[PDB]
Scaffold this active site. Sequence first.
Site, PDB file in Angstrom:
ATOM      1  N   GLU A  34       0.826  -1.169   0.000  1.00  0.00           N
ATOM      2  CA  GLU A  34       0.000   0.000   0.000  1.00  0.00           C
ATOM      3  C   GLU A  34       0.885   1.252   0.000  1.00  0.00           C
ATOM      4  O   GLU A  34       1.488   1.580   1.014  1.00  0.00           O
ATOM      5  CB  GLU A  34      -0.883  -0.028   1.251  1.00  0.00           C
ATOM      6  CG  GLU A  34      -1.862   1.115   1.422  1.00  0.00           C
ATOM      7  CD  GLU A  34      -2.594   1.027   2.761  1.00  0.00           C
ATOM      8  OE1 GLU A  34      -2.737   2.068   3.481  1.00  0.00           O
ATOM      9  OE2 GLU A  34      -3.033  -0.096   3.100  1.00  0.00           O
ATOM     10  N   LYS A  61     -11.027  -1.403   7.073  1.00  0.00           N
ATOM     11  CA  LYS A  61      -9.820  -1.063   7.804  1.00  0.00           C
ATOM     12  C   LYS A  61     -10.225  -0.626   9.213  1.00  0.00           C
ATOM     13  O   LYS A  61     -11.157   0.175   9.387  1.00  0.00           O
ATOM     14  CB  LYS A  61      -9.044   0.023   7.059  1.00  0.00           C
ATOM     15  CG  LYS A  61      -7.917   0.626   7.831  1.00  0.00           C
ATOM     16  CD  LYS A  61      -7.184   1.575   6.866  1.00  0.00           C
ATOM     17  CE  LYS A  61      -6.500   2.710   7.560  1.00  0.00           C
ATOM     18  NZ  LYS A  61      -5.538   3.328   6.558  1.00  0.00           N
TER      19      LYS A  61
END
Length: 202
Positions: A39, A128
């Site tokens: 990421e 998340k």
Amino acid sequence: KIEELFKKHKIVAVLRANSVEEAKKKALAVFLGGVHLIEITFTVPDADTVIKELSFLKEMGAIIGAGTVTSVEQCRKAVESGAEFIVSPHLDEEISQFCKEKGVFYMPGVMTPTELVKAMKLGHTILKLFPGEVVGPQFVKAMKGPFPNVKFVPTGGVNLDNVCEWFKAGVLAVGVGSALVKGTPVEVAEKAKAFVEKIRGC
């Protein structure tokens, strides 16, 4: 698909860095150490260029996405540069909608039951959890009662000592930043190896 990648790899490197060059070197370090989900956060200078220049690693099976995405303009640049997934620290309705139309996986960040429910209403079931160090595994276990079908990927403070507790609580994968990514390339590649082994180990 993306769900299935998180499920398989269990760890996403959350890559913050001060330069394009540092970010690329750390992404290579991490990949070389066995971390396939990478990421690139938008706090990295020219984060788009970094994603574009790592595009070739996709041919080696790396999955490169973008994190710390806070506007649709950033989201567009990331997708334009080859991001395979979008992550934000918060729940963003505008980014949710854009990613839905564009057909790209979006994982919004959530810290409360109300935020969680709003995200579910926008079609999300993989969330998340951020900041993980504030809420903890406790939060993940608490959500299993009322929301058995939501799965979390905590980001924030995940490290070598607590990674197994997180998986015990029922998380789908973990996002690891500074415990993995901070240091030199060599140290990062090595810490990458340790996390993979520690995760396999539980």
